[PDB]
From Swiss-Prot, chains B, C:
Changing G38R: In AMYLD1; amyloid polyneuropathy. Changing S68Y: In AMYLD1; amyloid polyneuropathy. The modification Phosphoserine is found at S43. Coiled coil: none annotated. This is Transthyretin. Changing V21M: In AMYLD1; amyloid polyneuropathy; by far the most frequent mutation. Tetramer dissociation and partial unfolding leads to the formation of aggregates and amyloid fibrils. Small molecules that occupy at least one of the thyroid hormone binding sites stabilize the tetramer, and thereby stabilize the native state and protect against misfolding and the formation of amyloid fibrils. It comes from Homo sapiens. Changing A100T: In DTTRH; increased affinity for thyroxine. Changing F24I: In AMYLD1; Jewish 'SKO' amyloid polyneuropathy. The gene is TTR. Changing A27P: In AMYLD1; amyloid polyneuropathy. Not glycosylated under normal conditions. Following unfolding, caused for example by variant AMYLD1 'Gly-38', the cryptic Asn-89 site is exposed and glycosylated by STT3B-containing OST complex, leading to its degradation by the ER-associated degradation (ERAD) pathway. Sulfonation of the reactive cysteine Cys-1 enhances the stability of the native conformation of TTR, avoiding misassembly of the protein leading to amyloid formation. GO terms for biological process: negative regulation of glomerular filtration; phototransduction, visible light; purine nucleobase metabolic process; retinoid metabolic process.
């Protein structure tokens, strides 16, 4: 898969499990078309969101439901979610979106290889 | 002003100057209404976006135009922008500082919330 | 003061108060000499650690006692502290702001460097 | 291995390759005894630093030579290195030390499992 999502918990020092992630692609009318989604695994990872054929150039949004996660832990969060918006190519790779979560802070990083 | 935005450049170790910032509020429509906008100063800060009267309860989105910043420096960044979405003033008026730290392929955002 | 330390709590979204900060400078010995120390204020900031006269070229270490902070809150953190080591004033006098953002199992540190 | 190190480059969006990492254990006289070391792989990871038998409770320091990395890229860095100091146990796990590097900023996170 050319697109993977890895989420970590900076309060507990652990992968975030069962966190909902939605992926959108920007449409012609500049609205967000649902594209893919899932829930992070026990390793805090989400694989097999798309394929090389489906993942064409364009602008994508990755939305991590961080609020629901912190609610499950009984911790009051600041953000409604974590949103990463990026342009796939040019030109032509494997994308790993990493997210490090705290209740009042998050960081996201793109690891782009091949 | 109950809402302040501060941006830093993690590559140069300096405040980001002239960075565009757009604020939106979720209408009952469920659509995003333009709420306020501006650009960061020399200190990388943006003050006076709004007032205590105007800044009511709601869900707000703060879009920082990081792409324009990096490209002006000859850098092609990963992100289109840095976007912060949060519920404000749910338990009464607060003062919010939104801090962003920018790298070409990474950013972090932190909220500092105080009771005026 | 050419050296300022600022600390934030990423769990509460607030400045960290009464956080111990110890500064060291590498002697020709290659050992760390106690240079200065203090505690953060209500704003999570620590000013007046040193002066332009005293703050010469060298390698400096800034140890933030994050463990004590978290444990006071009933939290058992991963890190013993947050430690920043850097060469200062190599190309002339600069003003340094060391920013730390604290979570129980994670921290980030950023340097903001300006020419006075 | 009960201790792994993963390093990423936030400027290029890539794992950091060939970055020297040194591990120390605090001794009785409170000095840092060299314990293990190596260079990150093509995946920016460093495995097999120690074993379950060797990795006993105590205070450890992990030192990442970030300065040399940025020098190789021709980018002026702020820090001399990135240092993570922590106490292994109590009580009794797999430690992953993650580091996200920028020239004037770094973040480190502990992922502790099992």
């Amino acid at each position: 898969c050319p697109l993977m999502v890895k989420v970590l918990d900076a309060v507990r020092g652990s992968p975030t499990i069962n966190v909902a992630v939605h992926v959108f692609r920007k449409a012609a009318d500049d609205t967000w078309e649902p594209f893919a989604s899932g829930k992070t695994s026990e390793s805090g990872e989400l694989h097999g969101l798309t394929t090389e054929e489906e993942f064409v150039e364009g602008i994508y949004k990755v939305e991590i439901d961080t609020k629901s996660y912190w609610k499950a832990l009984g911790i009051s969060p600041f953000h409604e979610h974590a949103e990463v918006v990026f342009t796939a190519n040019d030109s032509g790779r494997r994308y790993t979106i990493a997210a490090l979560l705290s209740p009042y802070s998050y960081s996201t990083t793109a690891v782009v290889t091949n």
